[PDB]
Design a protein around this ligand. Structure first.
Ligand code: ZNH
Length: 154
């Protein structure tokens, strides 16, 4: 699959708003993820003890993680599909150390879309949401191919 330049621009124009407060968007996204799919929290030996949204919002380590995740994703999006270099180390750590199935990447993709839709109705209409879905699908497809090369079922 390949996105058009117009699709990339819709993706990057909403990402520009995310970048006003990457930390806040990261918290909202991780919390949505853990609330919708509580099993995903079990992957974080650092965070699996957090019991409530309140505890999640007050966690500095969780905030730090959201910034790390969104900054990595932002870098990948900015490559506009030319993301092999960024994807290599990410695919290896997530296949081999963290053991994150593609299904869980689908879950966080859903959380991203939900938070953007809630926070950014001005820049996340149907067309922009479609473009973001296409970008995240491409990310997941490319990660999935790497998983396979690396020996992980995903
Ligand atoms: C979209 C998307 C995404 C992105 C971009 C990311 C990114 C990332 C980064 C950058 C980091 C740091 C470095 C490495 O590699 O290690 C990480 C880590 C990581 N991660 Zn991940 N992620 C993700 C998804 C995910 C999910 C979904 C999960 C689960 C479920 C995860 C789990 C993880 C973990 C567990 C870790 C580690 C943490 C700590 O701190 O230790 N993850 N991550």
């Amino acid at each position: 699959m390949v996105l058009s330049e117009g699709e990339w621009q819709l993706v990057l124009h909403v990402w520009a708003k995310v970048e006003a407060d990457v930390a806040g968007h990261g918290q909202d996204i991780l919390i949505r993820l853990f609330k919708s799919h509580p099993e995903t929290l079990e992957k974080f030996d650092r965070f699996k003890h957090l019991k409530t949204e309140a505890e999640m919002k007050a966690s500095e380590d969780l905030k730090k993680h959201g910034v790390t995740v969104l900054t990595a994703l932002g870098a990948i999006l900015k490559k506009k599909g030319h993301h092999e270099a960024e994807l290599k180390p990410l695919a290896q750590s997530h296949a081999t150390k963290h053991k994150i199935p593609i299904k869980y990447l689908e879950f966080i993709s859903e959380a991203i879309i939900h938070v953007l839709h809630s926070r950014h109705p001005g820049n996340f209409g149907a067309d922009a949401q479609g473009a973001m879905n296409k970008a995240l699908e491409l990310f997941r497809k490319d990660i999935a191919a790497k998983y396979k090369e690396l020996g992980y079922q995903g």
